[PDB]
Design an enzyme around this catalytic site. Structure first.
Site, PDB file in Angstrom:
ATOM      1  N   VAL A   1      37.414  28.959  20.170  1.00 47.66           N
ATOM      2  CA  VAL A   1      36.970  27.684  19.620  1.00 47.66           C
ATOM      3  C   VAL A   1      36.699  26.682  20.743  1.00 47.66           C
ATOM      4  O   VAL A   1      35.726  25.946  20.689  1.00 47.66           O
ATOM      5  CB  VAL A   1      38.021  27.105  18.619  1.00 47.66           C
ATOM      6  CG1 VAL A   1      37.683  25.651  18.245  1.00 47.66           C
ATOM      7  CG2 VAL A   1      38.056  27.968  17.336  1.00 47.66           C
ATOM      8  N   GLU A   2      37.532  26.694  21.783  1.00 43.96           N
ATOM      9  CA  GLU A   2      37.372  25.749  22.882  1.00 43.96           C
ATOM     10  C   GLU A   2      36.176  25.951  23.794  1.00 43.96           C
ATOM     11  O   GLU A   2      35.425  25.001  24.064  1.00 43.96           O
ATOM     12  CB  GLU A   2      38.644  25.699  23.738  1.00 43.96           C
ATOM     13  CG  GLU A   2      39.861  25.109  23.018  1.00 43.96           C
ATOM     14  CD  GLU A   2      39.685  23.649  22.641  1.00 43.96           C
ATOM     15  OE1 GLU A   2      38.894  22.942  23.297  1.00 43.96           O
ATOM     16  OE2 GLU A   2      40.345  23.195  21.694  1.00 43.96           O
ATOM     17  N   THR A   3      35.963  27.189  24.229  1.00 45.70           N
ATOM     18  CA  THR A   3      34.893  27.476  25.181  1.00 45.70           C
ATOM     19  C   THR A   3      34.155  28.781  24.927  1.00 45.70           C
ATOM     20  O   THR A   3      33.404  29.223  25.780  1.00 45.70           O
ATOM     21  CB  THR A   3      35.481  27.594  26.615  1.00 45.70           C
ATOM     22  OG1 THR A   3      36.402  28.698  26.671  1.00 45.70           O
ATOM     23  CG2 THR A   3      36.238  26.324  27.012  1.00 45.70           C
TER      24      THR A   3
ATOM     25  N   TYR B   1      40.006  22.328  12.447  1.00 46.97           N
ATOM     26  CA  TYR B   1      40.147  22.935  13.751  1.00 46.97           C
ATOM     27  C   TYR B   1      41.187  24.044  13.690  1.00 46.97           C
ATOM     28  O   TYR B   1      40.901  25.202  14.019  1.00 46.97           O
ATOM     29  CB  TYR B   1      40.593  21.889  14.777  1.00 46.97           C
ATOM     30  CG  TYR B   1      40.929  22.481  16.122  1.00 46.97           C
ATOM     31  CD1 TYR B   1      42.220  22.927  16.403  1.00 46.97           C
ATOM     32  CD2 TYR B   1      39.949  22.622  17.113  1.00 46.97           C
ATOM     33  CE1 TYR B   1      42.526  23.496  17.635  1.00 46.97           C
ATOM     34  CE2 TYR B   1      40.244  23.190  18.342  1.00 46.97           C
ATOM     35  CZ  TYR B   1      41.540  23.628  18.595  1.00 46.97           C
ATOM     36  OH  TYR B   1      41.849  24.235  19.786  1.00 46.97           O
TER      37      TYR B   1
END
Ligand code: NA
EC number: 4.2.2.n1
Length: 312
Positions: free
Chosen positions: A112-114, A295
């Protein structure tokens, strides 16, 4: 030979006549032994980015969850998640053993982050942090703390502070760790004596440590989908009700809740209606990375999707 430049007291650049930048320099010199001239040279190259300021200011049933979910859970992401998992399986297993945080959670967070290192940010960390520390009164104290730690981090890990890139808020590497998170939670998981936020092995252990530090309970359920509807009760990851109040509201758990006596009431907009869930402590721990129900649910389900795709 040696040029102390004691008489070079004024720096140029975007922060040339900025009182906050001057105060920050005095702090680094007094508190951390930085050389005023060396720091002025660094900050004279720092840029005041309007985009960074705009972005920080910017922050039914109609299918909201479904739209958020599909940004992350796609064949391409699940497949890349599988490749990342298999590639770093030892580190993931070791993190599970040492920290009690499972591979699906770590793989989900990094995804999800990168997208597992594919999108780590293009903004120079120094520009983002200097802009938010010196030209953003609302969160100046928070970001100046981050900038202070970033410069110390660069000094320790021996990096040129101007070479590091990341998000518009100064987040770095695979897990998009803020300087304060690096300081408090990052660990040398590769065992090479250093902590590199851009090294997948260190990032894995660092995310795991972050989770354990924020209360992750090994083997405990994250959330349990509920049968029934509870329209009369306020919902969200910050809510808290006893299992008794939730049953009295018309809900029953799809899976046994074990010894849990309370839970948050989560509600997902699935288009045709609302899907309620009993949020358990581990769900809230996921929100500690990003304060958002969507999220945290996307991080969890992405990890589950990858875990399943590995079985095949
Ligand atoms: Na390391």
């Amino acid at each position: 030979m040696v040029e102390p430049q004691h008489n070079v007291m004024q720096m140029g650049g975007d922060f040339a006549n900025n009182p906050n930048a001057q105060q920050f320099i005095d702090k680094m010199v007094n508190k951390h032994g930085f050389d005023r001239q060396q720091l002025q040279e660094i900050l004279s190259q720092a840029k005041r980015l309007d985009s960074v300021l705009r972005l920080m200011d910017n922050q039914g049933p109609n299918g909201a969850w479904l739209r958020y979910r599909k940004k992350f859970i796609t064949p391409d992401n699940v497949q890349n998640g599988v490749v990342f998992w298999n590639q770093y399986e030892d580190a993931l297993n070791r993190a599970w053993q040492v920290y009690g945080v499972p591979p699906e959670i770590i793989v989900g967070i990094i995804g999800v982050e990168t997208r597992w290192g594919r999108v780590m940010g293009k903004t120079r960390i120094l520009d983002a942090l200097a802009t938010l520390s010196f030209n953003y009164p609302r969160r100046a104290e928070y970001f100046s703390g981050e900038l202070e730690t970033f410069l110390l981090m660069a000094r320790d890990e021996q990096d040129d502070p101007l070479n590091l890139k990341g998000s518009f808020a100064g987040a770095m590497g695979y897990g998009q760790f803020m300087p304060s998170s690096y300081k408090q939670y990052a660990v040398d998981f590769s065992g090479d004596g250093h902590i590199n936020l851009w090294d997948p092995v260190d990032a894995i252990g660092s995310v795991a440590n972050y989770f354990k530090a924020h209360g992750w309970v090994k083997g405990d359920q994250v959330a349990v989908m509920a049968n029934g509807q509870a329209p009369g009760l306020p919902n969200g990851f910050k809510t808290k009700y006893s299992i008794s109040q939730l049953a009295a509201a018309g809900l029953t758990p799809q899976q046994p809740l074990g010894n849990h006596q309370q839970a948050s009431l989560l509600r997902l907009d699935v288009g045709t209606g609302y899907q309620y869930w009993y949020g358990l402590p581990n769900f809230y721990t996921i929100t500690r990375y990003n304060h958002s129900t969507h999220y945290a649910m996307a991080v969890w389900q992405l990890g589950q999707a990858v875990a399943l795709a590995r079985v095949q």
